[PDB]
Write the structure tokens for this entry.
Amino acid sequence: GLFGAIAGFIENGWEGMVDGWYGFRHQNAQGTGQAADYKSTQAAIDQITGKLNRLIEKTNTEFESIESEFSEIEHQIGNIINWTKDSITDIWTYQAELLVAMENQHTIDMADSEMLNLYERVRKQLRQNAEEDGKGCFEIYHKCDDNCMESIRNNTYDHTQYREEALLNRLN
Amino acid sequence: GLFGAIAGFIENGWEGMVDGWYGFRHQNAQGTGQAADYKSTQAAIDQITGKLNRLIEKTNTEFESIESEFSEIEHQIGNIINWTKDSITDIWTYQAELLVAMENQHTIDMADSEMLNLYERVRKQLRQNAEEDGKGCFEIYHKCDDNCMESIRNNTYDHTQYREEALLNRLN
Amino acid sequence: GLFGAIAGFIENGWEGMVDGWYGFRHQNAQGTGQAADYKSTQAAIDQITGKLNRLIEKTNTEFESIESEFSEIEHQIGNIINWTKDSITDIWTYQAELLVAMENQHTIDMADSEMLNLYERVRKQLRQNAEEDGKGCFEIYHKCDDNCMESIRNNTYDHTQYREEALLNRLN
Amino acid sequence: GDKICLGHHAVSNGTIVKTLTNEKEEVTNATETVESKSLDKLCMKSRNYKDLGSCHPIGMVIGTPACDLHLTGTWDTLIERDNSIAYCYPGATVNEEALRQKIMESGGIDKISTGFTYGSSINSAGTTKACMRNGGNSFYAELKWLVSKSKGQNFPQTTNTYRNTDSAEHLIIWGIHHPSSTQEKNDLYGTQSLSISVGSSTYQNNFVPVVGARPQVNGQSGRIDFHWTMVQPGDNITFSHNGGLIAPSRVSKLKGRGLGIQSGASVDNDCESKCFWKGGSINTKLPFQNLSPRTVGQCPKYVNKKSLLLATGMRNVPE
Amino acid sequence: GDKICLGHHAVSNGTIVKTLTNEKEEVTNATETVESKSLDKLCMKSRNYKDLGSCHPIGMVIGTPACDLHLTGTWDTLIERDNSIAYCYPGATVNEEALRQKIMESGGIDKISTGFTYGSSINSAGTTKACMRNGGNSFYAELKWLVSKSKGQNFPQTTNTYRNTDSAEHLIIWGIHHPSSTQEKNDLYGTQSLSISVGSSTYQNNFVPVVGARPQVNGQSGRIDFHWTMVQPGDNITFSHNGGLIAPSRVSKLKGRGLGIQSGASVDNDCESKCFWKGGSINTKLPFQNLSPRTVGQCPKYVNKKSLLLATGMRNVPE
Amino acid sequence: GDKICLGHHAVSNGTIVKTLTNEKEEVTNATETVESKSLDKLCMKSRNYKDLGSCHPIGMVIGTPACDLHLTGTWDTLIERDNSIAYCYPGATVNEEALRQKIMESGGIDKISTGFTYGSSINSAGTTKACMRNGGNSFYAELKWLVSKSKGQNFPQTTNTYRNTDSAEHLIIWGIHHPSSTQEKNDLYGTQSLSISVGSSTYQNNFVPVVGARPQVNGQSGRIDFHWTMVQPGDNITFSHNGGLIAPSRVSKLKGRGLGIQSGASVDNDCESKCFWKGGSINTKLPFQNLSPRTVGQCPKYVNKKSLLLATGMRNVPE
Ligand SMILES: *[C@@H]1O[C@H](CO)[C@@H](O)[C@H](O)[C@H]1NC(C)=O
Ligand SMILES: *[C@@H]1O[C@H](CO)[C@@H](O)[C@H](O)[C@H]1NC(C)=O
Ligand SMILES: *[C@@H]1O[C@H](CO)[C@@H](O)[C@H](O)[C@H]1NC(C)=O
Ligand SMILES: *[C@@H]1O[C@H](CO)[C@@H](O)[C@H](O)[C@H]1NC(C)=O
Ligand SMILES: *[C@@H]1O[C@H](CO)[C@@H](O)[C@H](O)[C@H]1NC(C)=O
Ligand SMILES: *[C@@H]1O[C@H](CO)[C@@H](O)[C@H](O)[C@H]1NC(C)=O
Ligand SMILES: *[C@@H]1O[C@H](CO)[C@@H](O)[C@H](O)[C@H]1NC(C)=O
Ligand SMILES: *[C@@H]1O[C@H](CO)[C@@H](O)[C@H](O)[C@H]1NC(C)=O
Ligand SMILES: *[C@@H]1O[C@H](CO)[C@@H](O)[C@H](O)[C@H]1NC(C)=O
Ligand SMILES: *[C@H]1O[C@H](CO)[C@@H](O)[C@H](O)[C@H]1NC(C)=O
Ligand SMILES: *[C@H]1O[C@H](CO)[C@@H](O)[C@H](O)[C@H]1NC(C)=O
Ligand SMILES: *[C@H]1O[C@H](CO)[C@@H](O)[C@H](O)[C@H]1NC(C)=O
């Protein structure tokens, strides 16, 4: 969509991922793995909760009856009330329809953004030592065991430490 | 703008491009060419159509006359009507002004985004075989004839096939 | 946030920077320096000013009193007025609340975007002669004196002039 | 190196719109959201309309000559014009505006007879030159001007009650004659105190005809005060009177729902529309309109803008 | 090379919502913003309510038998039902609606005695079978049907004035008897012209009882017209009369503020609520509701949508 | 390696605002959108204002002594104060509020003479010590208290008609005297039934002065009830009366448009403003204000927020 990741260059979601909203999935000599990203998932959830906290919990103002439900009244003043009340209903239904439409547009685009941010984070972390597949993956030009994969997942991966050889295998 | 492409790093539009909204333009040994991108152009148009379908052909609710055009009415009740009507006009004009303002902000920023996405697509396709000019162009460090240019335009370009030469020319 | 720069990969602001909103800061053999970017700072300020010029300065429509401040009016017609007025106050307070909320969301995300656009600008200027640190900095693989630093800040830096050396220092 | 460049289109014929940031953004294309055009006519295609012409809605219920073609009917749309006639013998109805509104929202009226009979000493067919038909003097078709059969004689104490035997409420109108001279009162009714009381289970009121001089319309210096109620199904309404009552001969049943239009625009049976105003008819898919806050039907919302352009293209950056 | 891939979650269990662009977007989850459920009861927990049952608010002020339990009280919430009784002897009050509203907005009523005394030749305890208590004929508790003590006797010219010595305005109601026959008038009052005048500093009016036949309700063919004003603190209100007045014995002071509810729903003392309508009670944190534009208290805003889903997840792209 | 780093500014001096996702966002700067300050004065610079002081708008039309300076004039702005005087002889006008409003929106009044003459047996110059000018007793400047020239004598049946020969509608006010005693009625008018009828082509009404005992204000126990209409251009309005009418000597033409302000704030001729309320004047470029729902002119919209900050800087991330 806006940020080109969700329903963009990442072709689809993972239904197996239930620990979080965004996450990682790897393959190296020791096999395959899956793991969720805490920071990005929490970033997205908190902003949805923010939205929910604003639409729930508002304090309403007091209103009294200006009609009678039972001793239906007089006609001229009634028509003025019906008019005014329908005119207001149009206003609130429209606003509601707009509010939700635009909040939704924003939620969807926000979620796309947090996915892109997670991509960009990792791309910069791998420095010269990987290449982008174009599908949401990075191909790592050095041998990256399960601890190395974890380093990438908690932003502790040291570029210096594998640069020598990454470059060497990129030189081909 | 928001995504930094349209009226950003791409200096200007192409008036010669009339087949689509976004597109390609190349230069190699055999000369120059121009061609539109379908998938990005369609992406943008469909979302504008979506917007138009929401605003146009909504069903309105019925209102009757609460005043008389012909027989002036009690002055006190008239003033209450004028007041309420003007109060409602202020509300609708403001909303309309807001609606259009924000939809337009979004349409423009959407269109910028689809342009960026098309850039990012091609960048990832060329892998290490090209470099970004900074002006919207990619300089290709291998000899890319018209069939090669088409391969990029229909996502069939295999970077592997030209990688060894590209890297060699990057290293000089 | 949305564009991942402000309160994203750039870990904090500079309080020493008072010449502008976004800017540069360097370190080379001759020491350190700080300088603001005109184009990006102006881009951000102008859109805030635009927003302010739409909300301030609006022309209002004329209203007369439909109540009396001094003389008790019929209780029935009074209740209809109170109702209508409270009904309209609810509408305006809600809209104001919404207007500001969403304009603020946009202002914040706009400002993030301009910071990203400045990053991207410089990244493309340095071509293959530098590498991204991941926290907002570029490490330059050639010796870049004060004139070279200014060339980057004024978009006159020619990568070709330092390319052979840069690549050599990237490779060993 | 060989090069491939990415870009977008532009146009030489650019358009300006408003955003949150900017009041003049060139975009490639844009479309209007505020309707400004109206048709000079009332688009009645495929509606059972009733054009009242010179008849005023209230004249349909009391039976003014101008309203003879419109004493009954069904319609989904009623059209009022601006100098329509309500009264032949001069007068005024209490809560005229409410009554006018109930009829304009009614979608049809049927007339049910009251069956009131009077007996001799009452002449129940008073006529006047103020309400002419063919030939000669007449009166409102739905009412009877009751009068002493003998010029000077006291009008008899009389009682008439109407009973609603339908399952819908009926509208009863009646009049009270305020004569121009003590002479005229004496000749039409007694020389006696006049008094008229009207009572149902949900309504109750008393009236006194008042003698006095008022400008001739046009016609007469007397006047008639019209009064009305709804009679509920199964309820009875009784009139006790001794001179001065203008009695109902028929009551009215308003039938369903209809759209009431006040306009001077002429009718056109070849266009359709769901929206109308004084200036005619408005037919558009746009959500807003420019033309009037005072409209009826299913209408776009009125706004104070000449124009509001929605962008339908990207930012326009020419070569 | 070894591979690390980035991805987001999805569900097979997808939900559809609306955006600015698209009317059908699958998202992973979403939540309702329009309340559609109401409770079929009136949630009165922790409120001083008063359920009037068969009593109509107006009967509280004149003292109809049906309203004996509700002639005084304090409350923060008043509940009216649909075929509540206001009148025993048939009649109507002028500006009934305003009066009904002042009471429903009042939060309590106290009754203050007028102290009117009459003296012999007046029997001030007239009763009727239309207003039964136990045993036998009665009358409105807050009024007195004054009548000549002797059947045919002329009713004495009388004057009574009530003085508001409180610091709050008081509500006075009175009635005027419109008898059914000249015979009945003669027996209750004189054979003389009747006339009643009422006057304060802020109010002034005259009345004439009118003899005439009207449908039996049901009960009687006579009627009473109730009239009322507020007497300002320190002001006097005087009644001058010679037969036909239905005099106040007690006036009313309305006390503060309260929420007036019109509903047929039955009361429940173990739920709480700040929002009510005819169909009962609405208790929700959602900003909008589906159930009625006609609601009272602190209510979500009424909208014309069955449903409006707010996305609480990302776009859903399954495998 | 040498390095170049990109960054943004921050401040220690942070500000908190609200967004769609967060209720506490620090930003570098922000600006208020809700006006909370008002000026304690009425900013009248470059307006033709009329400050009525002690005069009530209605007194301008009947000619109360307090309003002698304001019987005619043109203005674009009218100012009413809180204990302004409308009546000298105690009384009230029907639809007082509508009348008050028409004048406050009028931008000027001119007085046109009725030309009513009465002839002997009528003394048309009744005065009272309730309406003092000096020396001595007076009456409303625009009306005449007509009375039998001889104390006990019956007041002659009389007829006066006023004819609007202008091309603008005129406002006619008249009064009806409600005397305190049958003795007072007898002395001012006949011992006869009084009746006053008023009739034009578009207006028709009847009145009966009514006698009764009432509190003194201030002054008198009698009263006057004022009634009014518009007379259309070319129309005639006739008064038929035999005692009790308080006749117009002058009618009023309301001229154009003006802004009516009700306030006790004192005037200031050095500031300008387009917005006013009871507490004074509001002058701001902000779209919303905090001060009152009850405002007049071109006003920002009233809201129930103390403050709403609009971010004018980026997110604030300190060192
Ligand atoms: C791209 O697609 C076309 C059909 O549109 C296909 O025939 C062609 O072979 C493809 N391009 C190349 C360079 O093979
Ligand atoms: C010019 O642009 C307008 C919209 O701005 C469009 O309606 C029209 O078809 C275009 N015509 C030409 C000749 O470009
Ligand atoms: C302008 O927009 C409308 C729909 O909004 C469309 O019908 C038309 O194609 C557009 N004009 C051009 C030149 O694209
Ligand atoms: C009058 O109407 C009542 C219904 O309220 C009915 O019971 C009664 O029979 C009617 N009287 C006559 C004479 O028809
Ligand atoms: C669905 O969204 C709601 C929003 O309140 C949330 O509470 C719930 O945990 C979500 N459930 C799933 C299965 O995502
Ligand atoms: C009547 O009212 C006035 C105040 O309006 C008061 O001065 C006077 O005491 C009252 N009369 C009596 C007899 O109490
Ligand atoms: C602090 O911020 C305010 C805005 O909130 C600004 O106008 C002011 O100049 C600042 N003051 C100082 C001392 O930096
Ligand atoms: C804070 O706000 C206003 C504009 O919104 C500006 O004039 C003022 O100087 C600002 N202060 C600073 C330090 O930027
Ligand atoms: C009274 O006014 C009418 C207009 O309704 C006019 O025709 C007539 O001439 C006027 N009176 C006289 C005597 O002219
Ligand atoms: C609105 O009020 C009118 C009377 O003016 C009434 O006929 C109608 O029933 C009311 N609306 C509804 C939904 O009943
Ligand atoms: C609104 O009603 C007033 C009378 O209260 C009238 O003077 C005015 O003309 C009406 N508005 C318009 C635009 O005519
Ligand atoms: C950067 O631009 C300035 C113009 O302000 C120019 O004088 C300067 O020479 C440029 N940079 C260098 C390194 O020369």
About this structure: Chain C touches chain F through 78 residues (CB under 8 Å). The radius of gyration of chain C is 27 Å. Chain C has one domain: 1-172.
